[PDB]
A paper describes a structure:
This double substitution abolishes FttA-dependent termination, FttA-dependent endonucleolytic cleavage of RNA, and FttA-dependent 5′→3′ exonucleolytic cleavage of RNA. The structures obtained using the two synthetic nucleic acid scaffolds are superimposable. The structures resolve 12 nt of nascent RNA in the TEC RNA–DNA hybrid and proximal part of the TEC RNA-exit channel and resolve 17 nt of nascent RNA interacting with FttAprox and FttAdist, but the structures do not resolve RNA nucleotides in the central and distal parts of the TEC RNA-exit channel. RNA nucleotides −22 and −23 engage the FttAprox nucleolytic active centre, with the 5′-phosphate of RNA nucleotide −22 and the 3′-hydroxyl of RNA nucleotide −23 positioned close to the catalytic Zn2+ ions, poised for endonucleolytic cleavage 22 nt from the RNA 3′ end.
FttA has a bi-metal nucleolytic catalytic centre, comprising two Zn2+ ions coordinated by six histidine residues, located in an active-centre groove formed by the interface between a metallo-β-lactamase domain (MβL) and a fused β-CASPase domain4-7 (β-CASP).
Numbering used by the authors:
A (entry chain K): 2 to 57
B (entry chain C): 314 to 388
C (entry chain F): 1 to 120
D (entry chain G): 4 to 150
E (entry chain B): 783 to 821, 834 to 879
F (entry chain B): 1027 to 1123
G (entry chain E): 1 to 183
H (entry chain P): 2 to 49
Write the structure that this text describes.
DNA sequence: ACTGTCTGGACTGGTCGGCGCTATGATC
DNA sequence: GATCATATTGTCCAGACAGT
């Protein structure tokens, strides 16, 4: 299983929107980054909770 | 697509588009809209340009991605 | 319209509603602000505890007895009967005057001494 | 004598008719008759042997636009030259609109109508309290016939 | 109403005209003009510098138009030292 | 102090990039975002009275089934133009989920 | 009339409630959303008891909140036409008397309170019968059936309830007992 | 609110009140165009 | 909750719907009086909306800038053929009998065409082909299959003139002008079951609605009025067209109520028809376009919708956006391909709205404490409830002390921020890319050479 | 069934800057 | 003098249509 570019962008956008209005970060933060960077590090650490629904 | 050669203009692919707003936005806006009013056509807004005109997300790229979330997040 | 669709609809009685409102009051007491509910829910709980004629389990038993006794009545009729708790023909008549059926004196009497069982 | 229509500027049909009369008097025109009813706005009628005389008589006046090609039958304008009060045909209980007067641009309902005093009595529909007022019969226009 | 700000009229004289050789910035008032109200207090219709433009007021000319009304033309100069772009 | 035009070509290349939410933010959320009241019974634009404090559909009634829809003000102007051109657009509302 | 309903609905949980249990968060959202309002086909939404089943969340575009398909129990109150109910008079003013029967307050007309020209006493807010000589005071249990419900607004207070009381067999509990004694 | 102005052609000082001016012109030569004189308040200009 | 437009259904507005949607009735062909106030019953009536800031709308009670506008209706003295449907009307006039009103097809043919319509599906081309075939088949029948009444050919003259080729008792062939009232009466006789054969919806596209009896005047907001620099209000072209329409309609009503002869009534009817046709579309072929007093032709709703400058292209498909800058580009090999040179003046103007969280609270607090005149700073602060406050010198420290989790800070453009970089014309999707902000104190943009 | 003719529509996008216009012949 | 109703009704390509 692999993540497409559109799916990854949607996941990062949803995670950043969640972080902006709540949703505390599941990993450490560099104390000053934007929520988009927080979502990027969450994706890089493989800790994101958001899945992708695919038709079948 | 329909078994005959069609152009890309108002008399071709755009002409047989199922969306009223897609046909009206490109060419012959007045007569296309009036003919749609005559026929009582229903626009399902399944295209891209109609969602652009309205404000709904387009059905291409990230607009087709569906996401699921597990609520009990415990960091 | 509450929600997208309704699955089950039941005509609940006064006693069970009072129990549910007491549970909501306990939940609000567990909630940090001192106000459990709004004005309408608190006033409803006060009215229910003022008109708490029967215990919730006694009300449930009476309602199920009414439901199993006859067939033309519904949950609303049984709930209204257990709410009023009739004793004679007058209140039964003023309840069923505008209803679809004006019950005969025999079935009215049988409803009456079904009702007055374990009646406070 | 055939009746033709001359279109003129609204509100000054009488002035154009007087100008045409003066032109006919001082220019020897074969004009037979000129009519300008007050109810008809922006047009006048000319009884002339032919339309050519009509367009020649109205020529040179900037307030006369054109002459309609058709010919008006005399039965159409027969009712115009008839002695009849403006209050005739108005029955109480209907709704009228007041053209002029202090109540300009107001809808009302007719209560009393008389032809001897050339006046009519109307109650304002927008008034919360019913207060009848009197207004000239020619100052109202029927909008819906009802009893 | 319509008062842009206290500091925007700091370069104006008592006649509502800007003094020459005065440094100006964006939205700075050059000619103080008041208009009669539509259909209240007098409106504000002062001529101001463009928001993205600045410079120094080079000259002020007072004259009349063809109808005899007053006309004030303010020429403002800005030094353009060459730079990137 | 005018804005910068995001023309048809810019929208086309944003579609080609596959950026749906970026296009939504550019064309809608930053230019003419607005909210309207729509009647679910007939699709007409409902009227909201601040004095009465209530939202209702004048062509239809329906004081209950009225929903708030977020859309561009240009789309509302287009709907008004269509109504002025004796064309009735009926907005069939759908749930977001 | 009190009612218990099982309602399936989409509940929106904001990201600030992610750390909490999904059932508790859905219950909190439903309580802050639906409680205290009036529904045309349901009545006075009184309380949300619990949430039985919840589903996996779905994130819609343009919103970080999570939407869950949840089934829950709602306790509501629906006034019915020609329905009898017992209450207590809580407010009296000359044109009519207000009685509490539940979440709403029913209005009983002074003309139609009894088949007698009952006078309102402004000294102590009392109702005095001219011929029957029956005194109506605050805190008296009464029974009446409803004839008019106004559902023109979604606010409970703005809704109006009018009942009927001139029919025999209604009124105060003492009045009903006295009528039963004659029969 | 009267003020002094400089004529465009003759250059002599012209005195008039713009608030209540029925007509603004230089009476000395009839010129209808006037220049606002530069104020004597010291201004500071950065050298390049 | 929130709802989205799942689908749009199109149709023809019925006169009853126009009357119900109208908040006012317009009869005065004027906009403002001498003092500038709106005239009651006019086009600028407060019941249709408010543009001037002082006024308050009568229908909804809202001030200017928030009132959506409300439509009005004008009761025409005589029906007027809609030009956009006019040719289509002629098609119906060539398909339905003049007496019975049914289509000129047999019952078996009608049933077969119904099966053909049901079978093919939803492709537009097949529907248009079937409609054209049905119209061609019905237009060549001079005898009604249901009533047997004779039929006459109908000649369509552009834009809204209909001629019926009739025969006198002597066999001479002449042309009778079909008035819009007669056309509407003929269209009213067509039942709902024959409408799908003509390509009309029984409940949405009734043919009688194709002839205008009530004219929907647009809201004030959609045709706004502005005040020029000379103090004279500048009316819109649509406002002038509606003024002319109202004046002609009032003259026609006055002449009808006065018992004017037929020459008057048809002439005023033709004038009103021309005015309504120009109001629907001023570029209609065969008629002179409506012109202003200065000789400038007006653009009506059709020109507002169509064209490069129209609503569809100039306002809907493409529109001006906020938070955008534009300036000259200069080379900068010292930056990466991922980076764009953003000037300090541009960076301090364009603001990124960043929500205050537990990890960026100190940075956003420092941005607020810097202010709009110090880089890196902030320009606006939005509370969780939703009130936006502009940061000045006075409240710069007060807002910073009031900053908490959930607040939004519109901070200046910082290094590493993602922005779009587009050059026009955008021939391909590679004509815009997302770069990283690099802030330099010069004035021009800087883009890497590759 | 072919053939020339009449009618209708579109004519790349964006930006900087300016110029200039949007009443009048009767009436008291 | 200060107001006021009215103020006219360039080429090329493609689809539909009388004519032979
Ligand atoms: Zn509706
Ligand atoms: Zn001089
Ligand atoms: Zn309004
Ligand atoms: Zn027939």
């Amino acid at each position: 299983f692999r993540y497409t570019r559109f799916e990854k962008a949607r996941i990062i956008g949803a995670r950043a929107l969640q972080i902006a209005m709540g949703a505390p970060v599941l990993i450490d933060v560099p104390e000053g980054i934007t929520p988009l960077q927080a979502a990027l590090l969450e994706f890089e650490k493989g800790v994101i909770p958001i899945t992708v629904i695919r038709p079948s | 697509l329909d078994g005959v050669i069609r152009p890309i203009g108002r008399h071709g692919i755009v002409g047989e588009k199922a969306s009223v707003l897609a046909r009206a936005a490109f060419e012959i806006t007045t007569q296309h809209l009036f003919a749609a009013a005559e026929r009582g056509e229903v626009d399902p807004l399944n295209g891209v340009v109609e969602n652009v005109l309205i404000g709904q997300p387009v059905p291409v790229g990230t607009g087709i991605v569906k996401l699921a979330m597990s609520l009990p997040l415990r960091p | 319209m509450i929600g997208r669709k309704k699955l089950e609809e039941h005509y609940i009685t006064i006693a069970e509603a009072k129990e549910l409102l007491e549970r909501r009051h306990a939940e609000g007491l567990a909630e940090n602000p001192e106000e459990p509910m709004f004005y309408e829910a608190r006033v409803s709980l006060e009215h229910a505890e003022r008109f708490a004629k029967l215990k919730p389990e006694q009300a449930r038993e009476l309602k199920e007895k009414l439901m199993g006794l006859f067939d033309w009545i519904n949950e609303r009729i049984a709930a209204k009967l257990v709410d009023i708790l009739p004793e004679d023909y007058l209140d039964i008549r003023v309840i069923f005057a505008k209803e679809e059926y004006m019950p005969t004196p025999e079935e009215a009497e049988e409803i009456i001494k079904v009702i007055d069982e374990y009646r406070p | 004598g055939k009746i033709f229509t001359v279109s003129v500027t609204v509100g000054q049909e009488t002035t154009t008719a007087n100008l045409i009369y003066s032109k006919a008097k001082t220019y020897n025109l074969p004009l037979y008759a000129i009519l300008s009813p007050s109810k008809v706005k922006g047009y006048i009628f000319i009884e002339a042997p032919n339309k050519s005389a009509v367009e020649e008589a109205i020529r040179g006046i900037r307030h006369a636009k054109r002459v309609l090609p058709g010919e008006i039958p005399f039965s159409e304008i027969e009712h115009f030259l008839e002695e009849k009060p403006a209050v005739s045909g108005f029955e109480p209980g209907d709704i009228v609109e007041l053209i002029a007067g202090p109540f300009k641009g107001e809808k009302a309902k007719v209560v009393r109508v008389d032809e001897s005093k050339d006046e009519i009595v109307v109650e304002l529909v927008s008034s919360v309290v019913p207060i009848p007022v009197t207004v000239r019969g020619e100052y109202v226009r029927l909008i819906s016939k009802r009893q | 109403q319509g008062y842009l700000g206290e500091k925007y009229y700091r370069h104006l004289d008592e006649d509502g005209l800007i003094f020459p050789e005065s440094k100006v910035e964006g939205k700075d008032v050059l000619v103080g003009r008041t208009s009669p109200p539509r259909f209240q207090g007098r409106r504000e219709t002062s001529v101001t510098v463009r928001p993205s433009e600045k410079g120094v007021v080079d000259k002020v000319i007072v004259t009349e138009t063809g109808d005899g009304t007053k006309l004030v033309k303010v020429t403002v100069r800005d030094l353009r030292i060459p730079e990137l772009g | 102090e005018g804005g910068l035009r995001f023309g048809e070509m810019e929208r086309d290349v944003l579609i080609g990039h596959g950026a749906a939410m970026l296009l939504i933010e550019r064309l809608l959320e930053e230019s003419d975002k607005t909210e309207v009241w729509v009647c679910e019974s007939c699709g007409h634009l409902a009227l909201e009275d601040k004095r009465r404090g209530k939202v209702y559909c004048p062509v239809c009634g329906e004081d209950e089934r009225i929903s708030k829809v977020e859309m561009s003000y240009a789309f509302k102007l287009l709907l008004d133009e269509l109504k002025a051109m004796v064309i009735r657009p009926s907005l069939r509302l759908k749930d977001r989920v | 009339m009190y009612k218990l309903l099982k309602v399936k609905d989409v509940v929106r949980i904001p990201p600030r409630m992610f750390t909490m249990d999904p059932k508790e968060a859905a219950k909190i959202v439903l309580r802050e959303t639906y409680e205290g309002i009036y529904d045309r086909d349901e009545g006075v939404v009184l309380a949300i008891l619990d949430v039985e089943e919840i589903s996996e969340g779905v994130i819609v575009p343009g919103d970080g909140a999570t939407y869950h398909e949840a089934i829950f129990n709602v306790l509501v109150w629906e006034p019915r036409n020609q329905e009898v109910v017992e209450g207590e008079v809580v407010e009296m003013m000359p044109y009519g008397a207000f009685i509490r029967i539940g979440p709403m307050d029913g209005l009983v007309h002074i003309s139609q309170l009894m088949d007698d020209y009952v006078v309102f006493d402004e000294k102590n807010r009392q109702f005095i019968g001219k011929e029957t000589n029956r005194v109506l005071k605050l805190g008296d249990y009464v029974r009446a059936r409803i004839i008019g419900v106004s559902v023109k607004s979604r606010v409970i207070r703005e809704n109006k309830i009018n009942m009927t009381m001139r029919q025999p067999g209604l009124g105060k509990f003492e009045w009903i007992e006295k009528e039963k004694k004659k029969a | 609110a009267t003020a002094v102005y400089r004529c465009a052609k003759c250059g002599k000082e012209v005195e008039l009140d713009l608030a209540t001016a029925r007509e603004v012109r230089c009476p000395y030569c009839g010129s209808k165009i006037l220049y606002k004189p530069r104020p004597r308040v010291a201004r500071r200009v950065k050298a390049i | 909750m929130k709802k989205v437009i799942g689908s749009i259904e199109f149709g023809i507005l019925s006169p009853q719907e126009i009357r119900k949607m109208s908040a006012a009735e317009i009869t005065v062909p004027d906009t403002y009086d001498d003092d500038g106030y709106p005239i009651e019953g006019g086009l600028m009536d407060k019941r249709l909306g408010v543009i001037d800031p002082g006024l308050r709308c009568e229908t909804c009670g809202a001030r200017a800038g928030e009132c959506p506008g409300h439509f009005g209706h004008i009761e025409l003295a005589r029906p007027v053929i809609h030009v956009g449907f006019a040719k289509t009307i002629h098609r119906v006039l060539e398909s339905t009998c003049r007496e019975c009103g049914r289509i000129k097809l047999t019952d078996e043919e009608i049933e077969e065409y119904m099966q053909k319509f049901e079978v093919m599906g939803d492709r537009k081309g097949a529907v248009d082909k079937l409609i054209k075939e049905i119209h061609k088949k019905a237009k060549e029948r001079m005898v009604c299959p249901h009533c047997g009444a004779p039929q006459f050919p109908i000649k369509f003259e552009r834009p809204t003139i209909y001629w019926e080729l009739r025969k006198d008792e002597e066999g001479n062939e002449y042309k009778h002008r079909m008035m819009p009232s007669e056309v509407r009466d003929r269209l009213e006789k067509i039942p709902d079951k024959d409408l799908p054969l003509l390509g009309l919806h029984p409940e949405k596209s009734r043919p009688e609605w194709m002839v205008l009896t009530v004219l929907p005047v647009p809201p004030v907001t959609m045709r706004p009025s502005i005040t020029l620099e000379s103090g004279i209000r500048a009316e819109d072209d649509l406002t002038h067209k509606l003024v002319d329409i109202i004046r002609i309609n009032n003259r026609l009503k006055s002449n009808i109520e006065a018992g004017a002869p037929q020459l008057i009534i048809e002439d005023l009817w033709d004038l009103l028809q021309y005015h309504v046709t120009t109001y629907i579309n001023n570029e209609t072929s065969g008629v002179p376009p409506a012109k202003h007093k200065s000789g400038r032709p007006l653009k009506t709703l059709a020109q507002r919708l169509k064209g490069k400058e129209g609503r569809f292209r100039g306002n809907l498909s493409g529109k001006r956006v906020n938070f955008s800058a534009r300036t000259v580009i200069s080379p900068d090999p010292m930056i990466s391909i991922n980076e764009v040179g953003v000037p300090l003046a541009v960076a301090m103007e364009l603001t990124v709205p960043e929500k205050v969280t537990e990890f960026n609270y100190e940075k956003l607090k420092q941005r607020v404490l810097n202010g709009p005149e110090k880089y890196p700073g902030a320009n606006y602060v939005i509370d969780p409830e939703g009130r936006r406050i502009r940061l000045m010198e006075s409240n710069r420290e007060l807002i910073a002390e009031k900053l908490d989790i959930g607040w939004t800070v519109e901070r200046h453009l910082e290094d590493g921020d993602v922005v779009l970089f587009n050059r026009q014309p955008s021939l391909h999707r590679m004509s815009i890319m997302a770069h990283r902000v690099r802030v330099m104190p010069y004035r021009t943009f800087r883009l890497n050479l590759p």
